[PDB]
Amino acid sequence: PREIITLQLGQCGNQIGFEFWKQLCAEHGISPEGIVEEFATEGTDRKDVFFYQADDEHYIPRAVLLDLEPRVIHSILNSPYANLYNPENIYLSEHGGGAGNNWASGFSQGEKIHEDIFDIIDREADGSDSLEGFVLCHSIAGGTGSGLGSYLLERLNDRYPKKLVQTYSVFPNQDEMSHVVVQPYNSLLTLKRLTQNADCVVVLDNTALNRIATDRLHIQNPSFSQINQLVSTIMSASTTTLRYPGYMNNDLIGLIASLIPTPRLHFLMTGYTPLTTDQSVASVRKTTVLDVMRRLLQPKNVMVSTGRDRQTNHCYIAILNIIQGEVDPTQVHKSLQRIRERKLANFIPWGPASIQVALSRKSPYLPSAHRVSGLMMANHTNISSLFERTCRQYDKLRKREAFLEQFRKEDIFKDNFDELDNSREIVQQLIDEYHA
Template sequence: MREILHIQGGQCGNQIGAKFWEVVCAEHGIDSTGRYGGDSELQLERVNVYYNEASCGRFVPRAVLMDLEPGTMDSLRSGPYGQIFRPDNFVFGQSGAGNNWAKGHYTEGAELIDSVLDVVRKEAENCDCLQGFQVCHSLGGGTGSGMGTLLISKIREEYPDRMMLTFSVFPSPKVSDTVVEPYNATLSVHQLVENADECMVLDNEALYDICFRTLKLTTPSCKYVYASVSSAIFVDKCFCSREHWPNLKVDIPESRLKL
């Protein structure tokens, strides 16, 4: 099986990742404890792409969760699917990046990067035939942009023949008042051009526009925005309805060729 290792970093990346795993679990018929409870065996057809089946029969996501502050990790662990992840795969610091790209890339992030890489290696070793990595992060904050791009460059050095796909949320001045977000995004784009094979651009302003115009929400909260992103990732990964599971293909190189 051609496995995909999912990495989510920063507050935005982790919250989008949490919604993404809720969608994937629902499609595969996996409950919040990692047990299969679906209604069709076809749901388990390609479950090993995103999950590692433990000896006890539980399905554990092939996921690495990182942040430079513990708050997001705590909220994920206490969430509806927090217990499905492997506890050792939560890697976090205590200081935060303070929306500073340099802190995430050169100082605080650089101090934590080896711990994240250790988890990435362990997950990669558990794969029979790893096809690549997918990284979920934002380019406006300090962790997702600075440390996220640092991790991408390190993975590229260590796994040069594996595909690298990113889902990058670009900032917008209309939905944020943080003045350094454009600088963080500009510094990150160069890194993505150098080290990513595919970069799916997710425009923050367009996401809110979907909530306003399509979902008809007057004051959209973050959960609706993150749900929209997770749905976009899900569709991009070539998932389809249960009736078509035999034709399911989750292949990063193929999606790159199609683009």
């Protein structure tokens, strides 16, 4: 009983959460409609911890999908994955809302559909004997997921302040501003609520997702279907201590405690190397373990945009290196002999750092019985490069005179704008003070 409730929210958050539930059946080796193999219970030792308990021989997701954009949720019930979602423990079919790519649209839809959002994750949090937490499958992209996503960052942390809250926030694309223009306003609003009513988050940058999406997956046109590939893999990978076997840090709130070092600095960086098209051509020369954390040490796998001149004036505190699949574990300490010699990762020389490595076996799946997959969950204190960027794209836009009255047309008839800026330079200053 370490049950986690997913809150799939927004136009981009339903799509990243679709390929995450669809990924789980493909590795348990089963049909999304049922149990067709014994690898669902022999391979995943522990059957259900993201699904409600069995009384029909089916694994029914613990997902709520509320959105003000109905196209994305209509791409679920005409998908051949509409035999995984059973509507009666998930949601009532069709959920409508505002226009509404504004932050103030999804933010008000949380206050008049207030009855259903606080009556749908509590009809699904009553079977649990003790709740683990909430994963906010919400986005900063769009106003549907950033508006509704900003409300639940408060109300889940005054009612359940002990439960894990943690969002997979993906920023809206920062090399364009020709499809979204409300981007500096809605990002800073969620980040304030993240800095004083939050436990841990896992944030990613969308321009650093798309640098990998064209360098490993080898497409010439970035498309929001190749960007969602990176997010379903690292979601299912972080909890292969819990849902899949583990021992040390077997709770996902075990792993995450040593990735929280002090309030408002616990924004965890994600890295995941093996994605290449020909990753599977290295089983002719030995799928070795003598390079599977020299590729997690080598800096070229970042989903956070950050300089290479920030790797000698910042220092890591906690670094997680999860190796997955077959591994031959009697040479994994031999590989860890070798991390300290290159020093392409630094340590704070005033306090302790910790280099956690762990391995876990998985259900028959080609990426985890013939291939080595490495998830890094870093906590590097160079994360202030996104926070300064979000702030410079904000302070230039208020001088153009935009959204200081072009924003006050839905439930904002007061000022609160300099409350987000002032808090934001304290976060960057308290990050920068914490290493020397």
